[PDB]
Amino acid sequence: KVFGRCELAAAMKRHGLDNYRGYSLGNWVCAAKFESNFNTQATNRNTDGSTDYGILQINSRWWCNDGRTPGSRNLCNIPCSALLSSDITASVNCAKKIVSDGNGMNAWVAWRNRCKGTDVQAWIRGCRL
Ligand SMILES: [Cl-]
Ligand SMILES: [Cl-]
Ligand SMILES: [Cl-]
Numbered sequence: 300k301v302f303g304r305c306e307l308a309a310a311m312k313r314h315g316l317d318n319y320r321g322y323s324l325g326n327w328v329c330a331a332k333f334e335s336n337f338n339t340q341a342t343n344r345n346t347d348g349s350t351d352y353g354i355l356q357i358n359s360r361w362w363c364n365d366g367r368t369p370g371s372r373n374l375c376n377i378p379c380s381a382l383l384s385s386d387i388t389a390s391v392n393c394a395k396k397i398v399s400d401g402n403g404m405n406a407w408v409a410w411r412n413r414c415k416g417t418d419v420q421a422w423i424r425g426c427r428l
Contacts, residue, residue, distance in 0.1 A: 300339045300340070300385035301336070301337055301338045301339075302331075302337040302338075302339070302354070303337070304328065304422065304423075304426070305423070305425070305426035305427070307328060307331060307337055307354070307387075308324055308328050308422070308423045308426050308428060309426070309427075310387050311324060311327050311328065311331075311387070311391065312324060312428055314387065314388060314391040314392075315391070315395075316391050316394065316395070317428075319395055319398065320395075320398045320399055320403060321403075322398065322403070322404055323419060323420070324422075324423050324428070325419035325420045325421065325422040325423045326404060326410065326414060326419050327394075328419075328422035328423055329410065329413070329414035329417070329419045329422045330355060330404065330407050330409065330410040330414055331354045331355055332422065333409040333410070333413045333414065334351075334354065334355055334356035334407060334409050334410075335353065335355070335356055337354065338354070339353055339354050339382075339383055339384060339385055339387065339390075340353075340383050341353060341354065341356065342383070343356060345358070345360075347360065348367075348368060348369070349368045350365055350367075350368070352365075352379045352380075352382035352383055353383050353384075353387075353389075353390045354387060354390050355382075355390050355394050355407065356407070357375070357379075357390065357393055357394065357397065359371055359379050360372070361374055362374050362396070362397060363375055363377050363379035363381070363382060363393065364377070364378055364379060365378070365379040365380075374396060375389075375392070375393035375396055375397075377389055377393065
């Protein structure tokens with residue numbers, strides 16, 4: 300599913316991501332924009348052989364099981380395929396664990412490089428939330 304901008308903001312809020320660990324909704328929408336362009340089916344293969352999955356490009360080295368990432372963990376206790384669903388529940392629940400791991404949203408390199416320090420409120424501007 301490719302979400303609309305406000306549609307995704309609303310879904311993220313529904314699932315308790317808004318201001319989670321102090322990160323406003325615009326941060327999360329911005330991260331999703333640059334990780335996946337709001338496409339739940341997004342996948343990308345990393346140099347180390349791990350793969351990133353879903354709207355927030357969650358990585359199989361630590362967070363989910365794909366059966367093809369040697370030496371990896373599955374800390375969200377989910378198949379990586381769950382992160383591709385039109386229902387963002389699994390991605391949100393896993394993201395909550397990731398952002399609580401110590402480095403906040405810096406875990407998403409694209410958030411650090413493209414969202415951090417910017418006017419992230421622009422991502423939810425106009426949205427009925
Ligand atoms: Cl915001
Ligand atoms: Cl594996
Ligand atoms: Cl980047």
